[PDB]
């Protein structure tokens with residue numbers, strides 16, 4: 001009853017151009033079996049949404065990567081939020097929700113916006129820049145580590161540690177094994193900065209530790225919650241901002257709409273998250289036999305959710321392969337859905353918004369003027385290099 005496919009969604013050929021194979025996965029049926037890795041897959045919006053919103057049946061505590069924590073030891077101590085289920089997930093989640101809350105955004109927005117304006121001013125003096133290294137990477141690195149309260153030394157470990165985390169979600173292919181092989185210095189730095197004395201007052205890290213006396217988390221749980229923000233707080237924001245610039249360069253008509261109304265900046269970034277989905281995939285593990293889209297899945301089975309495919313499913317979206325900055329993006333799963341829905345989504349949206357705002361007000365044209373190079377990652381989609389010429393407005 002279940003179609004079996006040989007598509008490897010963690011192969012370089014798939015990463016290079018995933019959209020044909022994603023249509024093949026969607027159109028084969030609501031539930032497929034991927035013979036390459038012995039996992040079930042769901043690529044349509046309907047099933048991805050249903051799986052995300054049943055955390056009891058499709059749990060996260062056995063890992064959201066390929067590895068089943070009931071069978072293999074995790075490569076690091078499990079995340080207290082990403083790799084936990086309710087009720088254990090609930091109170092650590094509440095702490096991170098308050099640390100990255102709407103009220104918190106008010107305290108950082110002025111500085112985040114000023115740094116975005118300053119970066120675009122700087123890039124316009126150069127003219128021809130690399131929109132990844134010089135913009136999508138440079139800007140989040142200039143605001144988020146400071147907002148965490150991290151010292152200056154050792155920050156070069158942050159993006160390599162994130163690449164380790166996201167490649168480690170994948171199967172034991174070369175991308176994963178090579179990341180783990182080189183991991184030791186990046187893990188050592190990150191684990192050390194999670195300790196309370198190393199986090200500057202007022203920052204995200206210090207605020208997590210401050211919650212340890214409310215009864216929501218214990219003192220020994222605070223370092224791992226800081227670890228979550230150091231794991232996830234940068235790489236997808238980089239990829240999302242790079243995706244947005246990529247979209248505005250490929251769809252000049254949408255840049256012109258954004259220039260004419262800079263208040264479209266927030267939705268232009270949200271549409272970029274739907275369109276290029278920085279997080280392509282996450283796994284769940286069945287806790288029981290379950291019927292999903294007319295398919296019977298046994299207990300203890302890994303289910304691969306194609307978030308990027310769900311965000312381009314024509315059963316849900318009109319013209320899904322068009323970048324439309326006034327699209328009603330509500331309901332896309334680029335940040336997930338349900339109880340694990342990205343707790344740092346307000347930070348990512350703030351950075352994306354103020355950067356696209358600076359571009360909307362300061363830049364007249366964005367033209368690719370060099371070879372575009374893709375970055376390969378078992379879990380993330382993003383660019384390695386995006387040479388563009390910025391023309392001032």
Ligand code: HEM
Nearest residue numbers: 081082232233236237240278334335336340342343344348
């Ligand atoms: C464009 C940027 C981002 C994207 C596309 C993204 C994507 C996602 C997705 C899809 C999930 C769901 C995980 C699941 O369902 O298993 C998630 C969760 C999470 N994200 Fe993000 N994220 C982004 C930015 C951030 C930022 C900036 C932070 C921290 C400052 C962050 C921290 C987290 C954490 C801690 C979780 C776990 C939440 C939970 O398990 O309850 N992310 N993210």
Ligand SMILES: COc1ccc(C(=O)O)cc1
Nearest residue numbers: 079082165227228231232
């Ligand atoms: C890629 O998204 C995430 C989310 C959470 C974590 C974590 O909690 O460690 C890591 C990566």
